[PDB]
Amino acid sequence: KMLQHIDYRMRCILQDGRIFIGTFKAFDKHMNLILCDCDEFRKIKPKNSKQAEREEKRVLGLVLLRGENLVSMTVEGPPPKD
Amino acid sequence: PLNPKPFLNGLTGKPVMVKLKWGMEYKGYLVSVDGYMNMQLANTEEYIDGALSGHLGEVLIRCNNVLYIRGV
Amino acid sequence: WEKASGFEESMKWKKLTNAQRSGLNQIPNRRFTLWWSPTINRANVYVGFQVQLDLTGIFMHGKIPTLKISLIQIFRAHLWQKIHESIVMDLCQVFDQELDALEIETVQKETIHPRKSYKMNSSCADILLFASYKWNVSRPSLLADSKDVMDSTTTQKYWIDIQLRWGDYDSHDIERYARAKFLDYTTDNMSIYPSPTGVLIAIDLAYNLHSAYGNWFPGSKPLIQQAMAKIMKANPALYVLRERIRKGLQLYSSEPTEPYLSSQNYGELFSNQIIWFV
Amino acid sequence: KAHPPELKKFMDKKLSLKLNGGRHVQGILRGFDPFMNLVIDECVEMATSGQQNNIGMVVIRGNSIIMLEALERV
Amino acid sequence: KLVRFLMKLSHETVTIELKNGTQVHGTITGVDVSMNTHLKAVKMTLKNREPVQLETLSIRGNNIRYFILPDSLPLDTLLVD
Amino acid sequence: EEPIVNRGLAAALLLCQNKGLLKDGYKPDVKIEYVDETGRKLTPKEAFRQLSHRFHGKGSGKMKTERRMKKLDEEALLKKMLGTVALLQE
Amino acid sequence: LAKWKTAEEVAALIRSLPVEEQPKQIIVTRKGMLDPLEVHLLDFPNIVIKGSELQLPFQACLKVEKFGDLILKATEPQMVLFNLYDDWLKTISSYTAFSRLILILRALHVNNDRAKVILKPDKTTITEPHHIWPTLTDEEWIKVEVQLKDLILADYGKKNNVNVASLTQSEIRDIILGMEI
Amino acid sequence: IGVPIKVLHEAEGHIVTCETNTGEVYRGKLIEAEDNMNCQMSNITVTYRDGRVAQLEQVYIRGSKIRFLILPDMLKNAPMLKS
Amino acid sequence: EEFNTGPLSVLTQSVKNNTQVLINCRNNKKLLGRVKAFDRHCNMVLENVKEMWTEVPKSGKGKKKSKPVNKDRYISKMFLRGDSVIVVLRNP
Amino acid sequence: AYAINVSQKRKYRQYMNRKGGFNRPL
């Protein structure tokens, strides 16, 4: 059911609370995600913020996250043109 | 010169004590053991950190939750 | 009992008409006749005039309109057909729950004419069992026959028939009835059976009895035994029949009260259920 | 189909392994295993208390094998 | 296998409580043999956090602790082979 | 008076017990029970009503169906569970 | 007719409450009250009218000054309710608060002034106008419950001609609830 | 051998980082990358959870301990566009 | 054959007669109910599951001085996987 | 080592207002 969510700007939450947001382009049988141009978000998440939307964020780029530390994933935005 | 599977087969019915990884212990008679070494105890008591809280009857401890088992 | 209760709280005080008063006075006679039906509706008491009840398997020996009305009230809304249907579905469910344990490929719902439930002259099939392997069958034996002699033959399709009867006092022996009707329907010409081998279970609703005499295969004896036990214990249609009979008889059997709030029963007072002390 | 890890360059070399309960150890690896088990000869403790206790021939399971840093030249 | 009964539970509104205390309630649309729950129009409430509604979610079966089905779930007809 | 102890299952079982919350050759477990599409066990009267409705080919009316649905909703609400207002008003 | 009027008032109080607030179990203190209660509650068969072997000392509420004055000054019949536990639901459970309330009621039924003086360990503590019981801490309420249990045991020993060291916790719980040993 | 496994196998000999489950992150140049996420790297800087950072001429992280694998942007487009 | 003689037979005997059993998981929660279906991976599907655990006010007064309470929740039909389940015991 | 407790549908076949053959449908 992930084939309709390939190369999309999705947000995947890890098992430690440090979620990632990026282009979920490649998956595996062991739920290994390959997120290109992905950013990190652990403390705050941007949803109608009053003070700061991007707080405590770290740039990651291309991250190959294993499925042992993965909990869930959800789409956050539409895929870009490039 | 004693493999753990005949040791668990011979301890079926004898009063032993299976200590789990969470710190609890089940003290009673073992029923059977599968290939994944799952624990089945009858007429056992649940001891939390060495303090017994009461008998349970027929208890089943999973494979990836038990730590050790000593024949009492 | 409940003397002077009736269906309308006995409607004792009223401005009722004299005819209505006569009917109310005759109602206890209806209760008495219903109570003593098994011993007065028998052919020994009345010779001739053996007429079956409408859409019901009960025969009325002697024109007793009181008993006719009482029995019609008890068996209202095709209760006989519903009872037979409930019994057959329960037996099929029991057999499906224990299908592979006795080497049965499957069970079958035979097309049954409505009258079959109350058809005494002839009969038909109720349940058909299909097998993956051959069933060796034994010689006929009763439900209580612990020792059975094996017959030297096998089969693939096995029939089960259910016959409900309303036995009077002289003919309330369920075993004799089951044996006679099995030996009659099998060797009958207006009754067609899928196979010569099968089992016929006769159930006496008037006395709550049950017995089977047909041909049996190994493993079916205990299954049928506990099936009959559970179906006499918890059938919905049979329970409705019993409740209707109790209401017609006005048998308000006394019942005990709940346990009082002692020193060992107060612990349920703090549960999720709302309880109050007055 | 249990392929063993590439532990040929770390064989006969003094390396430091990390145990998953926040522990450390140091010793010379004398082989490999398909279940990532490491046999370490002359294994010192080198715990978080600051004292190193040599044991000798020890075996470590692959479930607690966190990291392995080759202190010697590989 | 009980995974085949969860795989046939598509287009059903159920809840799933994870190992971190996050409970996600939504209409499950896809479930594999590894309990990969792909649901649409769900709402997830984390432990000591505000609930968030998402149009699509893909929760893994490894981090899923327990499930919760309503009273209109035919478990007597879905647990058969 | 026994609280729920951490990493222990005997305390919850003791609290639930104190609260009152508790031939071929074979032994066939012939179990017959009445259930509904909702999965709840049915009373014999309810089972007989369902059987009669299915046999007669006609179900209950709209008003009876609405009353049954309201009763089921009320039962579900009651089984899922004014002192503070009485304390604040006093 | 008085028992029928009381059963009709209980049925009207049950019917005035909604279905979410209506109880499913009724405990009758008097043995001659459950028989009309089955007649007066024929519209609600889901309630259980059960008896009670331990009689709760409900006269201790009438022996109190506030509830006694509210009962005496009421010239018109009303259904004004109250809370027996003021803030004992957020500090302790429902079983221990009911046990402490039953022990306080048994101590007040054994003696009015002695239990009134033992209920307040200090002369500076006072109760809220919205409450009934005086607001104390956990150790203060435990000491007051122990003093009330000791006074109830002394009254049971002086009344039933028994010793003080012959009743366990279950016997004290049965004597506080009203059961007979 | 999946497509992230083929991406991690093709990431050998380049600058990559491995974030472990304990909190330590080791960024360096990978040398060996197996199908079971076993990463043997050389000349990597490792930073623990306490904030200190050290350097190592050789390191070997297992597959279960490695929580995340930060890959460079050279192989993020090709040949991983048809997947 | 071997399905009624292993360690999971207590999970099979309580699911055959629909008996009530209590399972303590890894999250210190005791779920009591009648197990409707089981599997090889202990994926127990039960009906009318009462989950009882211990709860805390988490410093409601500001000095972290409170007593834990026995919290309870009810579920109509639950499907708990065998990964988080630690122990199980039938009712005596 | 699993066990499932499922009830019996016992499909209750129609008696009244069928308009077809007298015998019950399968």
mmCIF file of N, CA and C in Angstrom, chain G residues 17-96:
data_model
loop_
_atom_site.group_PDB
_atom_site.id
_atom_site.type_symbol
_atom_site.label_atom_id
_atom_site.label_comp_id
_atom_site.label_asym_id
_atom_site.label_seq_id
_atom_site.Cartn_x
_atom_site.Cartn_y
_atom_site.Cartn_z
ATOM 1 N N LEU G 17 -34.014 10.625 38.358
ATOM 2 C CA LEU G 17 -32.661 10.528 37.837
ATOM 3 C C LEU G 17 -32.682 9.935 36.428
ATOM 4 N N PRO G 18 -31.731 10.319 35.575
ATOM 5 C CA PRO G 18 -31.669 9.743 34.227
ATOM 6 C C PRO G 18 -31.204 8.294 34.254
ATOM 7 N N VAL G 19 -31.177 7.693 33.059
ATOM 8 C CA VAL G 19 -30.794 6.289 32.941
ATOM 9 C C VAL G 19 -29.300 6.106 33.171
ATOM 10 N N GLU G 20 -28.499 7.140 32.902
ATOM 11 C CA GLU G 20 -27.071 7.058 33.193
ATOM 12 C C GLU G 20 -26.794 7.196 34.685
ATOM 13 N N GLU G 21 -27.701 7.836 35.424
ATOM 14 C CA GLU G 21 -27.543 8.025 36.859
ATOM 15 C C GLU G 21 -28.379 7.061 37.689
ATOM 16 N N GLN G 22 -29.237 6.263 37.060
ATOM 17 C CA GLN G 22 -30.053 5.321 37.811
ATOM 18 C C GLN G 22 -29.213 4.114 38.225
ATOM 19 N N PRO G 23 -29.289 3.697 39.486
ATOM 20 C CA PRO G 23 -28.514 2.537 39.933
ATOM 21 C C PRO G 23 -29.126 1.234 39.432
ATOM 22 N N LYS G 24 -28.319 0.175 39.507
ATOM 23 C CA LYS G 24 -28.745 -1.158 39.098
ATOM 24 C C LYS G 24 -28.793 -2.134 40.267
ATOM 25 N N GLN G 25 -28.516 -1.670 41.484
ATOM 26 C CA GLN G 25 -28.546 -2.527 42.664
ATOM 27 C C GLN G 25 -29.014 -1.695 43.845
ATOM 28 N N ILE G 26 -30.040 -2.178 44.541
ATOM 29 C CA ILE G 26 -30.613 -1.490 45.691
ATOM 30 C C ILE G 26 -30.411 -2.362 46.920
ATOM 31 N N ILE G 27 -29.865 -1.770 47.979
ATOM 32 C CA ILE G 27 -29.625 -2.459 49.241
ATOM 33 C C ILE G 27 -30.603 -1.906 50.268
ATOM 34 N N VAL G 28 -31.516 -2.752 50.729
ATOM 35 C CA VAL G 28 -32.528 -2.350 51.698
ATOM 36 C C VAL G 28 -32.000 -2.622 53.098
ATOM 37 N N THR G 29 -31.942 -1.575 53.922
ATOM 38 C CA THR G 29 -31.478 -1.736 55.297
ATOM 39 C C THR G 29 -32.514 -2.468 56.142
ATOM 40 N N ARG G 30 -33.776 -2.057 56.046
ATOM 41 C CA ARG G 30 -34.864 -2.719 56.751
ATOM 42 C C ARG G 30 -35.334 -3.921 55.944
ATOM 43 N N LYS G 31 -35.615 -5.025 56.638
ATOM 44 C CA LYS G 31 -36.062 -6.243 55.973
ATOM 45 C C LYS G 31 -37.497 -6.154 55.474
ATOM 46 N N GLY G 32 -38.299 -5.237 56.012
ATOM 47 C CA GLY G 32 -39.675 -5.089 55.581
ATOM 48 C C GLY G 32 -39.863 -4.010 54.534
ATOM 49 N N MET G 33 -38.794 -3.687 53.806
ATOM 50 C CA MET G 33 -38.841 -2.662 52.773
ATOM 51 C C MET G 33 -38.526 -3.173 51.377
ATOM 52 N N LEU G 34 -37.909 -4.350 51.246
ATOM 53 C CA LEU G 34 -37.589 -4.872 49.922
ATOM 54 C C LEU G 34 -38.815 -5.457 49.233
ATOM 55 N N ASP G 35 -39.826 -5.858 50.002
ATOM 56 C CA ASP G 35 -41.051 -6.423 49.445
ATOM 57 C C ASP G 35 -41.934 -5.399 48.720
ATOM 58 N N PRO G 36 -42.163 -4.165 49.214
ATOM 59 C CA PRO G 36 -42.842 -3.198 48.332
ATOM 60 C C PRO G 36 -41.927 -2.613 47.273
ATOM 61 N N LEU G 37 -40.608 -2.658 47.487
ATOM 62 C CA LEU G 37 -39.669 -2.098 46.517
ATOM 63 C C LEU G 37 -39.633 -2.912 45.228
ATOM 64 N N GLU G 38 -39.950 -4.205 45.302
ATOM 65 C CA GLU G 38 -40.117 -4.989 44.084
ATOM 66 C C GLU G 38 -41.424 -4.637 43.386
ATOM 67 N N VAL G 39 -42.413 -4.159 44.145
ATOM 68 C CA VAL G 39 -43.697 -3.801 43.551
ATOM 69 C C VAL G 39 -43.637 -2.403 42.954
ATOM 70 N N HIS G 40 -42.971 -1.475 43.641
ATOM 71 C CA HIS G 40 -42.907 -0.091 43.196
ATOM 72 C C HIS G 40 -41.909 0.133 42.067
ATOM 73 N N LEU G 41 -41.027 -0.827 41.799
ATOM 74 C CA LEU G 41 -40.036 -0.718 40.737
ATOM 75 C C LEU G 41 -40.280 -1.764 39.657
ATOM 76 N N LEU G 42 -41.548 -1.973 39.308
ATOM 77 C CA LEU G 42 -41.900 -2.911 38.251
ATOM 78 C C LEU G 42 -41.637 -2.361 36.855
ATOM 79 N N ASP G 43 -41.483 -1.041 36.715
ATOM 80 C CA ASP G 43 -41.185 -0.459 35.411
ATOM 81 C C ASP G 43 -39.708 -0.559 35.057
ATOM 82 N N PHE G 44 -38.845 -0.808 36.040
ATOM 83 C CA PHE G 44 -37.405 -0.943 35.826
ATOM 84 C C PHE G 44 -36.966 -2.308 36.341
ATOM 85 N N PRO G 45 -37.042 -3.346 35.501
ATOM 86 C CA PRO G 45 -36.635 -4.688 35.947
ATOM 87 C C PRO G 45 -35.132 -4.902 35.990
ATOM 88 N N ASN G 46 -34.334 -3.951 35.506
ATOM 89 C CA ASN G 46 -32.884 -4.091 35.482
ATOM 90 C C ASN G 46 -32.228 -3.775 36.822
ATOM 91 N N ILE G 47 -32.993 -3.330 37.815
ATOM 92 C CA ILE G 47 -32.464 -3.031 39.138
ATOM 93 C C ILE G 47 -32.633 -4.262 40.017
ATOM 94 N N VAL G 48 -31.694 -4.445 40.939
ATOM 95 C CA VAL G 48 -31.688 -5.584 41.851
ATOM 96 C C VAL G 48 -32.003 -5.066 43.248
ATOM 97 N N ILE G 49 -33.096 -5.552 43.822
ATOM 98 C CA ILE G 49 -33.524 -5.176 45.164
ATOM 99 C C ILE G 49 -33.028 -6.266 46.104
ATOM 100 N N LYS G 50 -31.835 -6.074 46.657
ATOM 101 C CA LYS G 50 -31.211 -7.044 47.540
ATOM 102 C C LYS G 50 -31.276 -6.565 48.984
ATOM 103 N N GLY G 51 -31.205 -7.526 49.904
ATOM 104 C CA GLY G 51 -31.209 -7.222 51.318
ATOM 105 C C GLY G 51 -29.840 -6.810 51.822
ATOM 106 N N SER G 52 -29.775 -6.575 53.131
ATOM 107 C CA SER G 52 -28.540 -6.179 53.789
ATOM 108 C C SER G 52 -28.442 -6.854 55.147
ATOM 109 N N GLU G 53 -27.349 -7.588 55.356
ATOM 110 C CA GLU G 53 -27.093 -8.222 56.643
ATOM 111 C C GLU G 53 -26.420 -7.279 57.627
ATOM 112 N N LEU G 54 -25.670 -6.300 57.129
ATOM 113 C CA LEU G 54 -25.034 -5.289 57.962
ATOM 114 C C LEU G 54 -25.829 -3.994 57.853
ATOM 115 N N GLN G 55 -26.407 -3.561 58.969
ATOM 116 C CA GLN G 55 -27.224 -2.357 59.008
ATOM 117 C C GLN G 55 -26.345 -1.138 59.244
ATOM 118 N N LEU G 56 -26.347 -0.222 58.277
ATOM 119 C CA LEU G 56 -25.545 0.984 58.342
ATOM 120 C C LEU G 56 -26.165 1.962 59.329
ATOM 121 N N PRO G 57 -25.382 2.545 60.242
ATOM 122 C CA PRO G 57 -25.939 3.499 61.228
ATOM 123 C C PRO G 57 -26.298 4.848 60.608
ATOM 124 N N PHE G 58 -27.469 4.887 59.974
ATOM 125 C CA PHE G 58 -27.972 6.092 59.329
ATOM 126 C C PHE G 58 -28.524 7.111 60.320
ATOM 127 N N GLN G 59 -28.668 6.743 61.597
ATOM 128 C CA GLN G 59 -29.120 7.693 62.604
ATOM 129 C C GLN G 59 -28.015 8.649 63.033
ATOM 130 N N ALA G 60 -26.759 8.357 62.682
ATOM 131 C CA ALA G 60 -25.663 9.263 63.009
ATOM 132 C C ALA G 60 -25.717 10.537 62.177
ATOM 133 N N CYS G 61 -26.301 10.471 60.979
ATOM 134 C CA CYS G 61 -26.488 11.679 60.182
ATOM 135 C C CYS G 61 -27.574 12.565 60.776
ATOM 136 N N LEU G 62 -28.630 11.957 61.324
ATOM 137 C CA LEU G 62 -29.662 12.736 61.999
ATOM 138 C C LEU G 62 -29.187 13.228 63.358
ATOM 139 N N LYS G 63 -28.213 12.541 63.958
ATOM 140 C CA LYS G 63 -27.648 12.996 65.223
ATOM 141 C C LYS G 63 -26.691 14.165 65.024
ATOM 142 N N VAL G 64 -26.251 14.404 63.787
ATOM 143 C CA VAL G 64 -25.384 15.536 63.495
ATOM 144 C C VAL G 64 -26.183 16.830 63.581
ATOM 145 N N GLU G 65 -25.477 17.943 63.793
ATOM 146 C CA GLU G 65 -26.156 19.223 63.970
ATOM 147 C C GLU G 65 -26.664 19.789 62.650
ATOM 148 N N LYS G 66 -25.851 19.727 61.592
ATOM 149 C CA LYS G 66 -26.206 20.364 60.325
ATOM 150 C C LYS G 66 -27.333 19.616 59.621
ATOM 151 N N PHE G 67 -27.155 18.308 59.412
ATOM 152 C CA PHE G 67 -28.184 17.514 58.749
ATOM 153 C C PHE G 67 -29.424 17.359 59.618
ATOM 154 N N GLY G 68 -29.245 17.292 60.942
ATOM 155 C CA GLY G 68 -30.390 17.222 61.836
ATOM 156 C C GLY G 68 -31.212 18.497 61.836
ATOM 157 N N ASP G 69 -30.537 19.651 61.830
ATOM 158 C CA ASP G 69 -31.231 20.926 61.723
ATOM 159 C C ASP G 69 -31.867 21.133 60.356
ATOM 160 N N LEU G 70 -31.247 20.622 59.289
ATOM 161 C CA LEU G 70 -31.846 20.726 57.962
ATOM 162 C C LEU G 70 -33.066 19.821 57.836
ATOM 163 N N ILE G 71 -33.056 18.683 58.536
ATOM 164 C CA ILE G 71 -34.207 17.787 58.510
ATOM 165 C C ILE G 71 -35.332 18.337 59.378
ATOM 166 N N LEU G 72 -34.981 18.972 60.502
ATOM 167 C CA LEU G 72 -36.004 19.478 61.409
ATOM 168 C C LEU G 72 -36.629 20.773 60.906
ATOM 169 N N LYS G 73 -35.836 21.649 60.285
ATOM 170 C CA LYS G 73 -36.344 22.936 59.826
ATOM 171 C C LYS G 73 -37.088 22.845 58.499
ATOM 172 N N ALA G 74 -37.014 21.714 57.804
ATOM 173 C CA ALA G 74 -37.693 21.562 56.520
ATOM 174 C C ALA G 74 -39.179 21.327 56.754
ATOM 175 N N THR G 75 -39.988 22.367 56.553
ATOM 176 C CA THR G 75 -41.432 22.237 56.693
ATOM 177 C C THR G 75 -42.081 21.598 55.475
ATOM 178 N N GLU G 76 -41.410 21.624 54.322
ATOM 179 C CA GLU G 76 -41.900 21.030 53.090
ATOM 180 C C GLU G 76 -41.019 19.857 52.680
ATOM 181 N N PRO G 77 -41.595 18.799 52.106
ATOM 182 C CA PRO G 77 -40.773 17.667 51.660
ATOM 183 C C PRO G 77 -39.976 18.019 50.409
ATOM 184 N N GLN G 78 -38.700 17.636 50.407
ATOM 185 C CA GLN G 78 -37.804 17.948 49.302
ATOM 186 C C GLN G 78 -36.837 16.787 49.109
ATOM 187 N N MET G 79 -36.027 16.881 48.056
ATOM 188 C CA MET G 79 -35.055 15.846 47.732
ATOM 189 C C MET G 79 -33.644 16.418 47.701
ATOM 190 N N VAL G 80 -33.307 17.242 48.694
ATOM 191 C CA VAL G 80 -31.984 17.855 48.748
ATOM 192 C C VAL G 80 -30.955 16.807 49.138
ATOM 193 N N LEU G 81 -29.957 16.623 48.280
ATOM 194 C CA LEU G 81 -28.907 15.637 48.487
ATOM 195 C C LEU G 81 -27.640 16.307 49.005
ATOM 196 N N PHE G 82 -26.660 15.480 49.370
ATOM 197 C CA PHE G 82 -25.378 15.975 49.845
ATOM 198 C C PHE G 82 -24.296 14.962 49.496
ATOM 199 N N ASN G 83 -23.072 15.267 49.920
ATOM 200 C CA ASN G 83 -21.907 14.418 49.668
ATOM 201 C C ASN G 83 -21.335 13.981 51.013
ATOM 202 N N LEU G 84 -21.245 12.665 51.222
ATOM 203 C CA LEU G 84 -20.653 12.153 52.454
ATOM 204 C C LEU G 84 -19.143 12.356 52.476
ATOM 205 N N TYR G 85 -18.474 12.119 51.352
ATOM 206 C CA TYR G 85 -17.045 12.386 51.239
ATOM 207 C C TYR G 85 -16.842 13.726 50.545
ATOM 208 N N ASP G 86 -16.203 14.665 51.241
ATOM 209 C CA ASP G 86 -16.015 16.013 50.713
ATOM 210 C C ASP G 86 -14.943 16.038 49.633
ATOM 211 N N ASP G 87 -13.715 15.667 49.996
ATOM 212 C CA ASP G 87 -12.600 15.637 49.058
ATOM 213 C C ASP G 87 -11.800 14.356 49.240
ATOM 214 N N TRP G 88 -12.483 13.269 49.594
ATOM 215 C CA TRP G 88 -11.832 11.981 49.797
ATOM 216 C C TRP G 88 -11.739 11.158 48.519
ATOM 217 N N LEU G 89 -12.366 11.603 47.430
ATOM 218 C CA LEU G 89 -12.288 10.879 46.169
ATOM 219 C C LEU G 89 -11.031 11.212 45.379
ATOM 220 N N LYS G 90 -10.466 12.403 45.567
ATOM 221 C CA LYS G 90 -9.242 12.797 44.887
ATOM 222 C C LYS G 90 -7.985 12.448 45.670
ATOM 223 N N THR G 91 -8.119 12.079 46.944
ATOM 224 C CA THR G 91 -6.984 11.713 47.784
ATOM 225 C C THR G 91 -6.887 10.209 48.005
ATOM 226 N N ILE G 92 -8.018 9.544 48.242
ATOM 227 C CA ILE G 92 -8.031 8.105 48.476
ATOM 228 C C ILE G 92 -9.047 7.452 47.548
ATOM 229 N N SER G 93 -9.188 6.133 47.654
ATOM 230 C CA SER G 93 -10.122 5.399 46.815
ATOM 231 C C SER G 93 -11.533 5.480 47.399
ATOM 232 N N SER G 94 -12.474 4.823 46.719
ATOM 233 C CA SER G 94 -13.865 4.824 47.148
ATOM 234 C C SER G 94 -14.156 3.804 48.240
ATOM 235 N N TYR G 95 -13.346 2.750 48.351
ATOM 236 C CA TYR G 95 -13.572 1.748 49.389
ATOM 237 C C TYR G 95 -13.088 2.247 50.746
ATOM 238 N N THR G 96 -11.898 2.852 50.782
ATOM 239 C CA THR G 96 -11.344 3.364 52.031
ATOM 240 C C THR G 96 -12.112 4.569 52.557
#
